[PDB]
Amino acid sequence: AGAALQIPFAMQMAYRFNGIGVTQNVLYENQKLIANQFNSAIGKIQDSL
Amino acid sequence: KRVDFCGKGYHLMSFPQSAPHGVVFLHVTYVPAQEKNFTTAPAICHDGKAHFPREGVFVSNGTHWFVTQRNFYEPQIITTDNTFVSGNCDVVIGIVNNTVYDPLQPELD
Numbered sequence: 650a651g652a653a654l655q656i657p658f659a660m661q662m663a664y665r666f667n668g669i670g671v672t673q674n675v676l677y678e679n680q681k682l683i684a685n686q687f688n689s690a691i692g693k694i695q696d697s698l
Numbered sequence: 699k700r701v702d703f704c705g706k707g708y709h710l711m712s713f714p715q716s717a718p719h720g721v722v723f724l725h726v727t728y729v730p731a732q733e734k735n736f737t738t739a740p741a742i743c744h745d746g747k748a749h750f751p752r753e754g755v756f757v758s759n760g761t762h763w764f765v766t767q768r769n770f771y772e773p774q775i776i777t778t779d780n781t782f783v784s785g786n787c788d789v790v791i792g793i794v795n796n797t798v799y800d801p802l803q804p805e806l807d
């Protein structure tokens with residue numbers, strides 16, 4: 650929607666969680682669990698493919 | 699609300715016009731420009747507790763900390779009405795020390 654603007658990644662997942670009704674307080678308290686779950690899921694999808 | 703359905707950028711309205719064998723839409727779109735640089739922080743620690751912004755984002759030109767909306771620049775002093783508290787800050791990554799001003803104490807005197 651114009652010119653690209655730099656933004657840290659964590660403060661993008663915060664906005665995306667805020668979008669779907671889950672308040673952003675959740676993300677900053679459980680960041681490591683989310684990272685581990687995402688990495689495990691991507692490994693699983695690579696293995697399945 | 700679906701992006702890029704009507705125009706390149708945020709959408710405001712459309713006007714229809716006739717044509718020989720078709721229709722012509724004039725979309726009105728809103729596009730920002732003249733950007734800047736800033737240093738951010740996800741939360742503010744005060745008195746051992748954490749403070750997060752209600753709707754906005756924390757910025758700081760280098761000396762003072764403000765909260766501004768995402769799509770435009772209009773800094774405001776960090777008060778206790780546009781921020782909310784959630785627990786104590788020892789696990790968040792990116793906390794920065796500061797003071798959060800409140801109006802009740804000055805209005806009390």
Ligand SMILES: *[C@@H]1O[C@H](CO)[C@@H](O[C@@H]2O[C@H](CO)[C@@H](O)[C@H](O)[C@H]2NC(C)=O)[C@H](O)[C@H]1NC(C)=O
Pocket residue numbers: 759760761762
């Ligand atoms: C960051 O912004 C703040 C808010 O304006 C600046 O603090 C004031 O700046 C004005 C001029 O911009 C001065 O006249 C005031 O004396 C400053 N202090 C106060 C309490 O109002 C601050 O100088 C800015 N910092 C930088 C590096 O630009």
Ligand SMILES: *[C@@H]1O[C@H](CO)[C@@H](O[C@@H]2O[C@H](CO)[C@@H](O)[C@H](O)[C@H]2NC(C)=O)[C@H](O)[C@H]1NC(C)=O
Pocket residue numbers: 791792
């Ligand atoms: C932003 O990134 C920098 C480096 O890319 C981080 O600086 C590191 O901080 C840790 C402490 O947690 C040190 O052990 C490292 O040695 C630092 N690296 C360098 C190159 O100085 C910085 O902490 C990051 N900021 C946040 C909020 O995560």
Ligand SMILES: *[C@@H]1O[C@H](CO)[C@@H](O[C@@H]2O[C@H](CO)[C@@H](O)[C@H](O)[C@H]2NC(C)=O)[C@H](O)[C@H]1NC(C)=O
Pocket residue numbers: 793794795
């Ligand atoms: C923010 O303030 C806290 C509270 O004073 C600082 O944490 C202390 O830092 C000193 C210096 O390293 C330690 O000796 C203390 O043990 C720390 N804890 C306490 C309870 O005093 C902290 O360093 C400050 N800065 C940041 C970036 O958090």
